[PDB]
Amino acid sequence: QYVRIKNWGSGEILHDTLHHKATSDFTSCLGSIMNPKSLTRGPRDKPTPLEELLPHAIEFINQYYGSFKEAKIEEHLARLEAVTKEIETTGTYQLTLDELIFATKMAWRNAPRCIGRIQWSNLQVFDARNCSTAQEMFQHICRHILYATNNGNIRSAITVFPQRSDGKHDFRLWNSQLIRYAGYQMPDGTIRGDAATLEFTQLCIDLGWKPRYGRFDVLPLVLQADGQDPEVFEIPPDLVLEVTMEHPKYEWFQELGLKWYALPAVANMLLEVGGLEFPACPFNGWYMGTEIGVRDFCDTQRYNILEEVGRRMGLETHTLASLWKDRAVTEINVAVLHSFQKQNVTIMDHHTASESFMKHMQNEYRARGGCPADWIWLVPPVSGSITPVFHQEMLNYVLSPFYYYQIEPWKTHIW
Template identity: 40%
Template sequence: MTAVHNGARTLPEAVDLDAAEGFLRMFHVAHPEAGAVSARLADVRAEVATTGTYRHTAQELSYGARIAMRDSGWCTSGLPWRRLKVRDLRGFRNAAAVAGECVEHLRLATNGGEIRPLITVFAPDSPSGPGPCIWNEQLIRYAGYSDGLGDPRYAAFTDAVRGMGWRAPAERGRFDVLPLVVETAHEGPRLFTLPSEVVHEVPIEHPDLPWFARLGLRWHAVPVIGNMRLSIGGITYPAAPFNSWFVGSEIGTRSLADEHGYGAAKPVAQALGLDTSSERTLWRDRAVVELNRAVLHSFDRAEVTITDHHAESLHRLSWLRGRQRHTGNRPTFRLDPGAARRARTGGPARFSGTDAETTQPQSPGRLAELLKHHQDRSSGLHSDESA
């Protein structure tokens, strides 16, 4: 919808009517109770002719988000995509409101450990103005510091948000939660501290190795993807955070064991008494197996939903056999190069014409006030409203 080239915002474009028609025909085939597609197409063409865009019905939005989730491959085994909860918050475009509802998403998704798959959809790009965007790759990520402490994958992002006003804890640790960065065209990037009560973490211990807990490893319970844009029928929703639940190897292999992450494979191997002098001893493989065992054991013990990579492999093969061929008209999640770069380096801003503010991050108390304000007005899933 809003074209962005080399970090600079250009004039908005009107909706592609072919994409809109393709999606609406697909929707009406799946939902014949919605009425004649010809009538809906006539309404959409008239709306686009007047405004340059159109508004999905709540049912169209839910269907499109669920199809995008299903076809993206992000649905983990055991996840009934048809029952994904879609939070329709298309009226929300101010940074504080978006951040507050991201906190609410985390609360709802965590669900006491019984992870609840959710998608929260914020304001779309349109000729009247672009929607908000979230910089963070996932809503919860850990800081990385120049001295090697923490998660080195996010060292550049950490430096960027410190330059924007974020203050690391007085006693820096290996698992300091980074602030949420929400950017809007009219406010620029703003920082928000996530309240500790919605950052549910699982300490990692091993079922057979008592010394494992002394490594001090832990991980957050819910993987909420924050920086992918949702495209449905020619409409782009740049902020549409969504989650399922973790595959154990995403934590054990990719985050904890990997040398580009926490590099825990070698300390584990040394504690096991393995020969780490050569990769040919396969010490790394043996250490990674124990890390993955520890992750699955710890999440199960904490009663937090998780799946393993073997179950996921079977699920993914089934998905590959049955997936639809992608066309330009099918709903999908996309990761733009600029969004990927912002998630790792903390820039450049999506709207380069707006200088990044140097400001203190909003406190957890402020977010709590926002949540209480929203909860006072509604209960359960939110209906669309202005914010």
């Protein structure tokens, strides 16, 4: 009938009906869409039909065993055999720790929106499939954060919780990411903290979390284990490393009293592998300057600090043509970069980042003749063409294993 389009800036929505008047095939392209269904893996009410499971499972095992040099046909056959048997006897099956590690890295490799994939091989895997309570999740999460942070020397890691069984017993981290500041609608009408986390913050407030009404209050873990309602847990402050923002030239920069957490970790995605689904598998890598300097600090819908960094630089903040914005954003980026380096916290600029990916992409094409890539995500939010990936044509397809998005729990959860 019509497609919905969202403007993540003003939040407005539009209904497109004109596309119906389109022509032949043409490579209605939904490329610019943030969360399309093709990238979401939703709820389930029953186990996965065996007819679908067994095939996918067999495929995964052949991939796994066909993965290493000096094949192990016996182990391979035995495993195929072993897995089939386990499926007809249990209705599902369990991956060996090695297959799990393999799945997590391949899924990573298969993440078309990640520019850090040259690191795919270096990944720590915390096996928590035996987890059973929310309290145990909290412990596992805390361990993860502590491990990954490594006192500023960031290390990539992921922890796998119990795989979805019937769909009515899913483990789910309700947060979008492990660490993330909250946003409050002040009584004077203004907004403090992360404007983008207003709702979720309310959700935590509603679940008993006590608001501290600050600009950088680290939100709480909202965990749901097995299938029960979500329980709230504050993250032990000693575990949230942060970087205070300061400019290498403008002393008035820290006067802005800005800072950001050092750990970038996605918390609400689903890991799909060999037919199995893991609705809870938080993972982390490390930051790319522009994420904080450009998106977090300069997005209108976020901290929105461009205007004042502008005036502080004594720019013509009232004349767009002056290009003051391009001037300020760069200085902010320099602040972030400088601060992370000074405080010995791993981070990387977008230029170094792009060249890195290009190398990955070529290695990838030589090793397996391809590399799924979402150009719209791989091109940094500043200096796009100054980057190699901007000039690189890319193909974006969904392989498997894969890290999918999933419907926000608070929407499809019965208390």
